[PDB]
Amino acid sequence: VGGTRSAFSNIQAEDYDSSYGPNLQIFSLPGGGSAIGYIENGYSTTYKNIDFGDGATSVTARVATQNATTIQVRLGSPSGTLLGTIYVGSTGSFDTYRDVSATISNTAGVKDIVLVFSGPVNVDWFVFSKS
């Protein structure tokens, strides 16, 4: 119960262990579950102890936004190694969620992962895979 979280099953974005974001909020979604939002440039959320097993090279995030932005995936801290960058084009509405993917450098073992935001976006969940 509450064991190590797999990188290969959805990680809920609201399930962060630490963050920088004075106005960042968790809120309920109409279709069930929750998202993080009220995000601004330089905000971040950190997810401890994610088990990448013997490696992942892709990330997918379920996101909503009205203006193009990016989400950096970093190792350990907001200033740690940049694993990859998710390019989030508009989904037309902060309430319309779509899946966007990106390549990451091969990440293996149990790792702390940080999402670093460049601008407004709502995030439901994210997950990793081997390309």
Ligand X SMILES: OC[C@H]1O[C@@H](O[C@H]2[C@H](O)[C@@H](O)[C@H](O)O[C@@H]2CO)[C@H](O)[C@@H](O)[C@@H]1O
* Residues annotated within a binding site for D-xylotriose: 38, 95, 122
Contact between 20 and ligand X by CB under 6 A: the answer reads no
Q: Is 97 in the site for ligand X (CB under 6 A)?
A: no
Partner in contact with 12, chosen from Ca ion, ligand X, none, beta carbon below 5 to 8 Å by kind:
Ca ion
3-state SS, residue 81: coil
74 to each of 2, 32, 36, 45, 104, how far by Cα in Å?
23, 28, 18, 10, 10
8 touches ligand X by CB under 6 A: no
Q: Which does 33 bind (CB under 5 to 8 A by kind): ligand X, Ca ion, none?
A: Ca ion
Cα Rg, the chain, nearest whole Å: 13
Query: Using CB under 5 A, which residues numbered 11 to 50 contact Ca ion?
Result: 12, 33-34
